[PDB]
């Protein structure tokens, strides 16, 4: 086959960023070269023709260009949405169809801290001698907020792990998932037990508690 | 527009073994034309051709004899089947809608693969509720409890609020250990109390188990 890349694998953009990536090859594909796009829970999307054939039922917002070893594609318009992945793919009779590594376009309005909520945890972790703690992280951005786990308000070396989530425009930010596990003789000796979050965005040290008897 | 119906659900030991359903809706199949596509979360994208438009078929080189297709013009219905599925052919399908055939328009439902060695397995019902505030608070958010199970699918229902497609629920996320976890929280009226007994549960799906049973306030004063 071929090898296919993309310039840059990820980008951070705007409401209105005239976007600007390329994808390049080592060998022209003459016409049939497809760039697409992917929107997570949802359908891809076929984005151009040729190298700027536009069609039914996209806005006009886009321009793709390139040629010889190099593509590109810039976008006049970015509506807030437009954060998404996007592949590039060329076409041939040649059954097998290769997929070029991902451009993980971002849209970016600040550096935010993360927010605070929690829920009980279920009885499943009481009964089998694994303490955990539950604290829900939610609304921040960018990623990188680092989480750590100090217990009494106690720095240790790890007891965290992360699995965030996705853009969600109802909020314009990112979320994550974690877990933690500890031994049961760790829940004694502490008495209060919250999380803590390392965020480019912070201008003070954090540190939450809350009530058990709330709600 | 053109509309399509898609189907099926496989879990199976390695090597398995399925036929599926694809009807498109709207329009005879004799003119358009239409392929599978493989969804995979974290593995990624993949997908299918046909014949006559595009000719023969696509499949991967060892899936070439593990997977086969037919058609069925008059019924206008598509149907896959496979006989050997592969250790890592673990996957949800779509079908594509084509127009100019090599770039897919509109989707289906779905097809899920499932080759684990975990076996069937259920959980049980925790419902959540908030503090004693509810008796004149006019809404507020509920919760559910349910981890550790076999396949994602995991149905919460209440008869209070909004209809049932308003439960905050949808299919959990599979590790290593092959286990599922996931929560449900609702936010239904306060004021049906009074008026409708509350019922919760769990309607899990590979869960071989039918106990129903109602809901009663905490009731603290007791």
């Known amino acids: 086959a071929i090898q296919l890349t993309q310039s840059p694998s990820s980008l951070s953009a705007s409401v209105g960023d005239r976007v600007t990536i390329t994808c390049r090859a080592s060998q022209g594909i003459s016409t049939y070269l497809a760039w697409y796009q992917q929107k997570p829970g949802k359908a891809p999307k076929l984005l151009i023709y040729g190298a700027s054939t536009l069609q039914s039922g996209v806005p006009s917002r886009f321009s793709g260009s390139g040629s010889g070893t190099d593509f590109t594609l810039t976008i006049s318009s970015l509506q807030p949405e437009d954060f998404a992945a996007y592949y590039c793919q060329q076409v041939n009779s040649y059954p097998p169809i290769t997929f070029g590594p991902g451009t993980k376009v971002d849209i970016k309005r600040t550096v935010a801290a993360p927010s605070v909520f929690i829920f009980p945890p279920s009885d499943e972790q009481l009964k089998s001698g694994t303490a955990s703690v539950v604290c829900l992280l939610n609304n921040f951005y960018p990623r990188e907020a680092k989480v750590q786990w100090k217990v009494d308000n106690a720095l240790q070396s790890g007891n965290s792990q992360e699995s965030v989530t996705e853009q969600d425009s109802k909020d314009s930010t990112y979320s994550l998932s974690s877990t933690l596990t500890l031994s049961k003789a760790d829940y004694e000796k502490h008495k209060v037990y919250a999380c803590e979050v390392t965020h480019q965005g912070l201008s003070s040290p954090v540190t939450k508690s809350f009530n058990r008897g709330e709600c | 527009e053109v509309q399509l119906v898609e189907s099926g659900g496989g879990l199976i030991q390695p090597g398995g073994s399925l036929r599926l359903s694809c009807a498109a809706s709207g329009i005879t199949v004799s003119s358009n034309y239409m392929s599978w596509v493989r969804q995979a979360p974290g593995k990624g994208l993949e997908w299918v051709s046909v014949?006559?438009?595009?000719?023969?078929?696509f499949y991967a080189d060892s899936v070439k004899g593990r997977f086969t297709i037919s058609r069925d013009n008059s019924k206008n219905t598509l149907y896959l089947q496979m006989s050997s599925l592969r250790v890592e052919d673990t996957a949800v399908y779509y079908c594509?809608?084509?127009?100019?055939?090599?770039?897919?328009?509109?989707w289906g439902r779905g097809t899920t693969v499932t080759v684990s060695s975990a076996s069937t397995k259920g959980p049980s019902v925790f419902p959540l509720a908030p503090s004693s505030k509810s008796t004149s608070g006019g809404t507020a958010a509920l919760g559910c409890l349910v981890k550790d199970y076999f396949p994602e699918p995991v149905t919460v229902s209440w008869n209070s609020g909004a209809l049932t497609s308003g439960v905050h629920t949808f299919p959990a996320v599979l590790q290593s250990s092959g286990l599922y976890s996931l929560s449900s929280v609702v936010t239904v009226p306060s004021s049906s109390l009074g008026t409708q007994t509350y019922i919760c549960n769990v309607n899990h799906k590979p869960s071989n188990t039918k106990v129903d049973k109602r809901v009663e306030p905490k009731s603290c004063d007791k």
């Open positions: 014949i006559y438009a595009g000719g023969s078929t």
């Open positions: 594509a809608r084509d127009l100019d055939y090599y770039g897919m328009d509109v």
